[PDB]
Structures are given as C-alpha cells and as structure tokens.
C-alpha cells in the first residue's frame, strides 16, 4: 500500500496507540495520527486526509460502533477502511460490527504478527 497512507489510531490508552503506531512504523507506515475516542476521531476524520482507521470498540463519548456507522454513512468516507482492535470478542458484537461494515477485527491482547497480517489482509480485500 501507499507508504504515505494516513492512518488514524483510536484508543483511550496511549500505550495501545503506541503499540499500534510502532507496528505501523514496522510495516513502513509513518503518517499516523491519534485520537482518544470516537468524537475526537470523527473530528479529525471530517477534517480530511485519512486513508485508514484503527479503532477500539468501547469508548467514552462515542464508541466504535457509532464511529463505524457514521463513517459508513458519510458521503466521502463511506468506504474508509475500519479495523477494530479491542478486548471485545462476543459473537453478537462481531456480528453487529460485520453487519455495520467493519473491515476487520483483532482481539486484544494481540501478537505483532496478528495485527500485521490483518492489516495486510484488509489492504488486500
């Protein structure tokens, strides 16, 4: 993929954001921005420039599902890739997310290999 692709990493924990950012760096992706919740994320996204979103599920203010639905209904970002990275793993939620258009899902804790593979996968697709 375009090494210049702009990623948005959304998670309440800076440590998790750090992990994701580092792995992206490993893959050759350095154009990364961070967000603490769905609202901040959406705010940045609407400002323009993004090519990929990595987000947690349960978040204050605006959760991953709402973020996802909002993105999918947007006139410009409807197809924006959205990778869920979260501790959440209930069948119901996987379904709802699948239904809503999530591009992928990685369960925390994840191995570097897992995240990287899923990433590559989405780029595929």
């Amino acid at each position: 993929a375009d090494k210049e692709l702009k990623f948005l990493v959304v998670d309440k924990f800076s440590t998790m954001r750090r992990i994701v950012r580092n792995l992206l760096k490993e893959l050759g992706f350095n154009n990364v921005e961070e967000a603490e919740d769905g609202v901040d994320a959406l705010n940045k996204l609407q400002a323009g420039g993004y090519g990929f979103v990595i987000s947690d599920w349960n978040m204050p203010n605006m959760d991953g599902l709402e973020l996802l639905k909002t993105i999918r209904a947007d006139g410009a970002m409807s197809a924006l890739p959205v990778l869920m990275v979260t501790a959440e793993a209930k069948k119901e939620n996987i379904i709802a997310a699948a239904q809503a258009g999530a591009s992928g899902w990685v369960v925390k804790p994840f191995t570097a290999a897992t995240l990287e593979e899923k990433l590559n996968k989405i780029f595929e697709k």
């Binding site: 793993a89 997310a97 899902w105 897992t114 996968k121």
Partner: peptide
C-alpha cells in the same frame, strides 16, 4: 459467547 481470533477471522478477517 466469546469468539476466538480464528473464529472471528472466519467472519471479519
């Protein structure tokens, strides 16, 4: 019902 990465993989990845 908790799905494993593998299981989830079958529907989302």
């Amino acid at each position: 019902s908790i799905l494993s990465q593998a299981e989830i993989d079958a529907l989302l990845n």
